Amino acid sequence: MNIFEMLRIDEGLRLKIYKDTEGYYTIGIGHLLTKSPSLNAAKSELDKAIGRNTNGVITKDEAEKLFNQDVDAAVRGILRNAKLKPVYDSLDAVRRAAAINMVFQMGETGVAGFTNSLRMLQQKRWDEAAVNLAKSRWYNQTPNRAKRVITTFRTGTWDAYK
Ligand SMILES: [Cl-]
Ligand SMILES: [Cl-]
């Protein structure tokens, strides 16, 4: 298991524009297109992202290419973030995957806002961090995905995904 296979499981793959759990226009492997309610604003962003006139549909290759960029951007946001970086540096390889997952789903700013949980993860207080991570809108809105991520932080294994 690795970050890529983990995110592919959590986000699925869709080749046509769809709405995410929050209702936003998305495509591929969890690639948010826009927060705007306009399908046209969405199609426009899409064509801009791919470099061609797509009419809202992409190929698997195109989907995977956006995915590779998005994982890279996710890691880099973590490394550029003064709150995230130290946490990330402190973690083992499996737990690092869980942090990347959260950033990919909710953005750097969002993750950065989990102050208390970040402090607990840095201290390696696994059980306490898991309880604190669960007291969130995130867990309440996407409970199965959150549990998976949380279990990963608690255990340091890929069991939630096997
Ligand atoms: Cl992009
Ligand atoms: Cl869920």
Tab-separated table of C-alpha atoms and ligand atoms in Angstrom:
chain	number	residue	atom	x	y	z
A	1	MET	CA	0.000	0.000	0.000
A	2	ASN	CA	1.271	3.569	-0.621
A	3	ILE	CA	-0.242	7.106	-0.700
A	4	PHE	CA	-1.441	6.688	-4.285
A	5	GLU	CA	-3.351	3.436	-3.729
A	6	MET	CA	-4.685	4.853	-0.446
A	7	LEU	CA	-6.103	7.988	-2.080
A	8	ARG	CA	-7.454	6.011	-5.063
A	9	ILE	CA	-9.477	3.932	-2.625
A	10	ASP	CA	-10.800	6.993	-0.718
A	11	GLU	CA	-11.614	9.179	-3.696
A	12	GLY	CA	-12.504	6.606	-6.426
A	13	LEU	CA	-12.025	7.436	-10.187
A	14	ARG	CA	-14.612	9.274	-12.368
A	15	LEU	CA	-14.030	10.393	-15.943
A	16	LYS	CA	-16.925	12.761	-16.149
A	17	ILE	CA	-17.548	15.918	-14.106
A	18	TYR	CA	-19.328	15.053	-10.850
A	19	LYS	CA	-20.191	16.643	-7.549
A	20	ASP	CA	-18.205	15.819	-4.422
A	21	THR	CA	-19.680	15.109	-0.952
A	22	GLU	CA	-19.877	18.849	-0.366
A	23	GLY	CA	-21.543	19.383	-3.721
A	24	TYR	CA	-18.593	20.816	-5.630
A	25	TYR	CA	-17.633	20.171	-9.242
A	26	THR	CA	-14.902	17.523	-9.367
A	27	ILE	CA	-13.287	15.121	-11.902
A	28	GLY	CA	-10.888	12.119	-11.855
A	29	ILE	CA	-9.382	11.115	-8.570
A	30	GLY	CA	-10.794	13.813	-6.261
A	31	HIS	CA	-9.539	16.796	-8.325
A	32	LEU	CA	-11.735	19.701	-7.122
A	33	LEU	CA	-12.461	21.922	-10.095
A	34	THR	CA	-14.306	24.861	-8.566
A	35	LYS	CA	-16.444	25.871	-5.702
A	36	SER	CA	-18.722	27.705	-8.084
A	37	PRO	CA	-22.261	26.414	-8.841
A	38	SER	CA	-21.754	26.925	-12.540
A	39	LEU	CA	-21.121	23.809	-14.578
A	40	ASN	CA	-19.742	26.173	-17.142
A	41	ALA	CA	-17.297	27.683	-14.699
A	42	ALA	CA	-16.372	23.941	-13.995
A	43	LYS	CA	-15.918	23.018	-17.684
A	44	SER	CA	-13.774	26.051	-18.199
A	45	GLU	CA	-11.428	25.146	-15.307
A	46	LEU	CA	-11.269	21.615	-16.633
A	47	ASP	CA	-10.126	22.615	-20.112
A	48	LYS	CA	-7.605	24.917	-18.465
A	49	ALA	CA	-6.311	22.065	-16.262
A	50	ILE	CA	-5.946	19.560	-19.250
A	51	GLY	CA	-4.920	21.825	-21.986
A	52	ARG	CA	-7.706	20.939	-24.371
A	53	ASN	CA	-11.391	21.374	-25.188
A	54	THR	CA	-12.869	18.571	-23.197
A	55	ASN	CA	-16.623	18.920	-23.041
A	56	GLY	CA	-16.433	17.597	-19.383
A	57	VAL	CA	-14.929	14.193	-20.112
A	58	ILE	CA	-11.303	13.040	-19.718
A	59	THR	CA	-9.331	9.835	-20.252
A	60	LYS	CA	-7.785	7.671	-17.506
A	61	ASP	CA	-4.279	8.947	-18.405
A	62	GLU	CA	-5.452	12.582	-17.993
A	63	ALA	CA	-7.034	11.625	-14.651
A	64	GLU	CA	-3.821	10.041	-13.450
A	65	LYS	CA	-1.787	12.986	-14.539
A	66	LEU	CA	-3.951	15.427	-12.485
A	67	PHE	CA	-3.665	12.925	-9.614
A	68	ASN	CA	0.172	12.915	-9.727
A	69	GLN	CA	0.222	16.719	-9.679
A	70	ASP	CA	-2.196	16.860	-6.815
A	71	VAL	CA	-0.235	14.471	-4.608
A	72	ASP	CA	2.965	16.414	-5.349
A	73	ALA	CA	1.256	19.741	-4.578
A	74	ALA	CA	-0.131	18.187	-1.350
A	75	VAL	CA	3.324	17.109	-0.103
A	76	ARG	CA	4.812	20.496	-1.019
A	77	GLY	CA	2.150	22.431	0.770
A	78	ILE	CA	2.940	20.417	3.903
A	79	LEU	CA	6.655	21.099	3.548
A	80	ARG	CA	6.068	24.839	3.035
A	81	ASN	CA	3.738	25.126	5.969
A	82	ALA	CA	5.353	26.196	9.242
A	83	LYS	CA	2.716	24.374	11.262
A	84	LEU	CA	2.616	21.226	9.215
A	85	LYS	CA	6.246	20.695	8.493
A	86	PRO	CA	7.474	19.908	11.971
A	87	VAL	CA	4.654	17.471	12.443
A	88	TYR	CA	5.265	15.684	9.227
A	89	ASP	CA	9.056	15.482	9.953
A	90	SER	CA	8.334	13.850	13.231
A	91	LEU	CA	6.208	11.024	11.735
A	92	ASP	CA	6.947	7.538	10.385
A	93	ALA	CA	6.259	6.704	6.695
A	94	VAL	CA	2.735	5.266	7.188
A	95	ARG	CA	1.527	8.153	9.328
A	96	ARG	CA	3.015	10.617	6.826
A	97	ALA	CA	0.589	9.079	4.251
A	98	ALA	CA	-2.342	9.844	6.582
A	99	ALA	CA	-1.297	13.502	6.852
A	100	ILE	CA	-0.977	13.746	3.057
A	101	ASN	CA	-4.474	12.271	2.762
A	102	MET	CA	-5.992	14.897	5.048
A	103	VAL	CA	-4.220	17.704	3.164
A	104	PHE	CA	-5.385	16.391	-0.183
A	105	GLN	CA	-9.010	16.332	1.066
A	106	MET	CA	-9.169	19.486	3.051
A	107	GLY	CA	-6.339	21.703	2.053
A	108	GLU	CA	-3.354	22.906	3.901
A	109	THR	CA	-5.184	25.640	5.718
A	110	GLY	CA	-7.828	23.284	6.926
A	111	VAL	CA	-5.331	20.773	8.332
A	112	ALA	CA	-3.218	23.522	9.829
A	113	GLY	CA	-6.341	24.439	11.866
A	114	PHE	CA	-6.296	21.126	13.799
A	115	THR	CA	-3.848	22.637	16.315
A	116	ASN	CA	-4.436	20.387	19.259
A	117	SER	CA	-4.434	17.127	17.227
A	118	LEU	CA	-1.187	18.182	15.503
A	119	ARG	CA	0.405	18.744	18.883
A	120	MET	CA	-0.696	15.362	20.040
A	121	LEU	CA	0.619	13.620	16.908
A	122	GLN	CA	3.992	15.340	17.334
A	123	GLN	CA	4.140	14.005	20.903
A	124	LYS	CA	3.183	10.555	19.650
A	125	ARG	CA	0.109	10.340	21.878
A	126	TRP	CA	-1.801	8.148	19.333
A	127	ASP	CA	-4.929	7.265	21.200
A	128	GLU	CA	-5.446	10.847	22.411
A	129	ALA	CA	-4.922	12.278	18.983
A	130	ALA	CA	-7.429	9.844	17.462
A	131	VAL	CA	-10.150	10.917	19.953
A	132	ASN	CA	-9.402	14.647	19.260
A	133	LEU	CA	-9.351	14.180	15.467
A	134	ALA	CA	-12.872	12.713	15.709
A	135	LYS	CA	-14.344	15.839	17.316
A	136	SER	CA	-14.561	17.595	14.024
A	137	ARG	CA	-16.934	18.497	11.230
A	138	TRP	CA	-14.662	16.376	9.021
A	139	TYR	CA	-15.329	13.198	10.920
A	140	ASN	CA	-19.043	14.001	11.138
A	141	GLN	CA	-19.484	14.649	7.456
A	142	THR	CA	-17.246	11.808	6.062
A	143	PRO	CA	-17.173	9.328	8.938
A	144	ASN	CA	-15.991	6.171	7.084
A	145	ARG	CA	-13.135	7.939	5.346
A	146	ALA	CA	-12.201	9.839	8.558
A	147	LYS	CA	-12.149	6.513	10.543
A	148	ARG	CA	-9.811	5.033	8.007
A	149	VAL	CA	-7.431	7.984	8.245
A	150	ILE	CA	-7.701	8.144	11.938
A	151	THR	CA	-7.013	4.419	12.332
A	152	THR	CA	-3.894	4.889	10.304
A	153	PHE	CA	-2.675	7.629	12.684
A	154	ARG	CA	-3.532	5.541	15.733
A	155	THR	CA	-1.863	2.325	14.593
A	156	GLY	CA	0.764	3.257	12.140
A	157	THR	CA	-0.289	0.303	9.879
A	158	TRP	CA	-2.387	0.039	6.697
A	159	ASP	CA	-4.926	-2.187	8.291
A	160	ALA	CA	-7.940	0.125	7.613
A	161	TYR	CA	-7.212	-0.236	3.978
A	162	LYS	CA	-6.584	-3.930	3.832
B	1	CL	CL	-4.487	22.203	-11.954
B	2	CL	CL	-17.169	8.687	4.421
